Amino acid sequence: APNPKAFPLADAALTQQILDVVQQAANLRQLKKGANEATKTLNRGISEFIIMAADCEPIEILLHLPLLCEDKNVPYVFVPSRVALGRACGVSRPVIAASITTNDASAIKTQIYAVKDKIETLLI
Amino acid sequence: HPSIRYVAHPLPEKAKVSIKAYLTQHERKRLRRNRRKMAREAREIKIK
Amino acid sequence: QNESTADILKQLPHERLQAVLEKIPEEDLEVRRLLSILKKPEVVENEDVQQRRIRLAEILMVDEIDLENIN
Numbered sequence: 392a393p394n395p396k397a398f399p400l401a402d403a404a405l406t407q408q409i410l411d412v413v414q415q416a417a418n419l420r421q422l423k424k425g426a427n428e429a430t431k432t433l434n435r436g437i438s439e440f441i442i443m444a445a446d447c448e449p450i451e452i453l454l455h456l457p458l459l460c461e462d463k464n465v466p467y468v469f470v471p472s473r474v475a476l477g478r479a480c481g482v483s484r485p486v487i488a489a490s491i492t493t494n495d496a497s498a499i500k501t502q503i504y505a506v507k508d509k510i511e512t513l514l515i
Numbered sequence: 516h517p518s519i520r521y522v523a524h525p526l527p528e529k530a531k532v533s534i535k536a537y538l539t540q541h542e543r544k545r546l547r548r549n550r551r552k553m554a555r556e557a558r559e560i561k562i563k
Numbered sequence: 564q565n566e567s568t569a570d571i572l573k574q575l576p577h578e579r580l581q582a583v584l585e586k587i588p589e590e591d592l593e594v595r596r597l598l599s600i601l602k603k604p605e606v607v608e609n610e611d612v613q614q615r616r617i618r619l620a621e622i623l624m625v626d627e628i629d630l631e632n633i634n
Contacts, residue, residue, distance in 0.1 A: 403532035414537045414608065479537045533595065536604030550617075553577035560575055 393445030393471055396454065399513040400445055400469040409442060409468060410479040412506050415499050416491050417481050423490045424480045426452065432490040433459050439491040440466040440507050444473030447487045456488060466510040576624075584620040586630060594619060601633060 393400065401409060416422040423432050432438035433456070441460050443453045460467045470476045477486030491503055572578055587594070594615055598605050603622050610618070623629060 403530070403534075407532060407535060410537070411535070475534075475536070481537065481539050483539055483542070531599075533605045535606040535608070537608045553580070557575055557577035557581075561572065561578075 393469075394450050396450055397443075397445050397469050399467075399515065400471065401510075401513060405468075405509055405513075406470050408509075409506055410470060410475065412491065412499070412502055413442060413476065413479040413489055414481065415502065416497075417479070419494070419497060419499060421492050421494050421497055421499070422480065423492055424477070424482065424486045424488075426456065426488045429456060429488040429490040430459065432492055433463055433465060436463060437493045438463075438465055439493050439503050440468070440510055442476060442489045442491070443467060443469050444476050444485075444487040445469045445471045447473045447485075453487050466507055466514055468510050468513060580620045580624050583623055583629075584616060587616060587619050587623075589613075589616055597630070597633070598622075 413422060423429060423438075429438070429441055429443075433441070441456060443456060447453055457467060473485040473487050476489060477484060480486045480489050491507075494500070497503070573582065587597075589612065591612065594612070595605060597619060598615075601622065603618070607615075607618065
């Protein structure tokens with residue numbers, strides 16, 4: 392298992408859907424990669440939801456975020472592989488945390504609310 | 516009738532999903548450039 | 564004559580790949596299954612079936628391994 396600590400962690404199918412939204416919003420410029428820009432989106436409050444990586448090491452550097460996500464009441468999930476995550480973000484270098492941000496004019500908004508809803512299902 | 520002496524630990528009972536691998540605009544441009552380079556050199560050397 | 568057109572043409576990298584594309588059967592589950600076993604990415608961002616077959620060909624070309632060698 393990808394660490395005992397990191398929670399929640401989606402399955403292969405929902406991971407596939409979430410990564411699909413990652414690539415899509417990445418094509419719509421509605422995504423912000425990286426832990427620092429994820430943190431910036433959380434502080435600004437424009438973040439729809441946070442994706443993070445399970446296989447990353449060390450895990451703590453991604454474990455600073457869940458506290459901030461629970462503070463701002465924003466959903467977050469853990470895709471298993473940072474290589475697949477950044478690969479979906481469109482960067483060869485593996486990305487650990489990505490953030491789907493808010494756009495009122497976005498065409499994928501409904502997709503973001505559906506995936507976000509399933510994320511809130513996972514959160515517990 | 517049941518056994519008090521011991522404690523059972525039975526049946527740790529337990530779906531393939533196609534992995535879609537996206538990739539960069541750099542590897543899309545590089546990929547198309549390589550494919551069209553193969554077809555282009557194939558038609559050029561072939562017609563040569 | 565020396566360096567026959569068949570030898571140069573088969574030596575050409577694209578056509579040498581096209582000869583391998585003729586050796587691979589075209590099926591969704593079989594083409595997909597060979598990628599799954601081969602550990603290469605099973606599906607890429609957006610591809611037609613023929614393009615997935617082309618990825619088969621390319622991967623068999625770069626790795627220098629054939630279908631009979633895999634299975």
